[PDB]
């Protein structure tokens, strides 16, 4: 397994998006993993529609702007046989009527792969060999809100009670000792302006910090 990975440097990640005031981080995380998988398969990077997901996956268990889950989203992409691009189905940040139009589909998944819960090495492994991995984390902390740079480590973080889905686009370390001060390169959906260009480095191999490895998964394309 490599010492560091950064899928953004390989063209698998779209520019940072903003979920605004709507609880769809789970949709952002889902579209991130999908955009990366579709890229690996076709060599084309296409921004996917989170709005598609907000409005149409209530049957799979999602709740549009009030929460949802990444695997439930992959689940919907599969039952539905498709997912529209952002350009054809724009994000408006509010629960609206499902207007999925298959002529505008640009992605597909036949299911998904899960990572054993709490297993950071399984996660590192999925990251290194597949591409960006959708993950859930506990982001209920002011320190996260105000995060600007470096490795984020918050003592009151939970590894069990999560409220936010993000995307692990890679991992690495700080310094020269590959085995220490490691972090997960995480893509957020609070705009380019939050954190470090919209990303956050989160303590790695520090007991499943903030639950990043608790319920990770990626779509099968």
């Amino acid at each position: 397994l490599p010492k560091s990975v950064d899928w953004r440097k390989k063209g698998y990640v779209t520019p940072v998006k903003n979920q605004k005031q709507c609880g769809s981080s789970w949709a952002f995380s889902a579209t991130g993993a999908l955009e990366g998988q579709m890229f690996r398969k076709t060599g084309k990077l296409v921004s996917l529609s989170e709005q598609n997901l907000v409005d149409c996956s209530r049957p799979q268990g999602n709740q549009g702007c009030n929460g949802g889950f990444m695997a439930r989203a992959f689940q919907y992409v599969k039952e539905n046989g498709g997912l529209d691009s952002e350009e054809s189905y724009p994000y408006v940040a509010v629960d609206e009527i499902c207007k999925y139009r298959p002529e505008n589909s640009v992605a597909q998944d036949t299911g998904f792969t899960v990572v054993a819960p709490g297993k950071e090495k399984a996660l590192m492994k999925a990251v290194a060999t597949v591409g960006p991995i959708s993950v859930a984390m506990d982001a209920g902390h002011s320190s996260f809100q105000f995060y600007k740079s470096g490795i984020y480590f918050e003592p009151d973080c939970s590894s069990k009670n999560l409220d936010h889905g993000v995307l692990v686009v890679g991992y690495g370390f700080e310094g020269a000792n590959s085995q220490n001060s490691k972090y997960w390169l995480v893509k957020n959906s609070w705009g380019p302006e939050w954190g470090s260009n919209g990303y956050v480095k989160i303590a790695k191999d520090k007991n499943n910090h903030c639950g990043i490895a608790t319920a990770a998964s990626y779509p099968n394309v």
């Binding site: 903003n18 979920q19 605004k20 005031q21 709507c22 609880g23 981080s25 982001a139 209920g140 002011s142 809100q145 409220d163 936010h164 609070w190 705009g191 939050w194």
Partner: peptide, 5 residues
């Protein structure tokens, strides 16, 4: 969750 902002 949503940004505090």
């Amino acid at each position: 969750r949503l940004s505090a902002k």
